[PDB]
């Protein structure tokens, strides 16, 4: 009921300033421009990450296992890996 709700009016905005109708155009362009800039920055970290995690290792240094490589090795092994381990164990540790 208060007069603060008068700010919702655009039918008669030409009686006070007629500025809102032009400023939001810039705001829509400014958002569009940032969407293209920021999306490029944050997205384009993957080529570096994809490359380093696959080519940055060297034999004169130790490659330490990450969190994902721990879970994948212990809780995401396939059937052939399970077979090969027990196949080696039964033959050498049990049957010599």
């Amino acid at each position: 009921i208060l007069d603060y709700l008068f700010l919702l009016d655009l039918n008669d905005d030409l009686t006070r300033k007629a500025v809102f109708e032009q400023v939001i155009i810039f705001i829509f362009i400014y958002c569009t421009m940032n969407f293209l800039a920021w999306s490029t920055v944050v997205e384009l970290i993957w080529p570096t990450h994809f490359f380093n995690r696959r080519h940055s290792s060297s034999q004169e240094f130790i490659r330490f296992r990450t969190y994902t490589e721990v879970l994948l090795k212990i809780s995401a092994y396939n059937d052939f890996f399970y077979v090969l381990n027990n196949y080696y164990y039964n033959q050498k540790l049990i049957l010599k």
């Binding site: 030409l14 300033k17 007629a18 500025v19 109708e21 032009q22 400023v23 155009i25 810039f26």
Partner: peptide
């Protein structure tokens, strides 16, 4: 209308 953001002098002066 006087309101004009397309001319940079008025964008500042207004």
């Amino acid at each position: 209308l006087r309101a004009d953001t397309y001319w940079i002098p008025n964008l500042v002066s207004q």
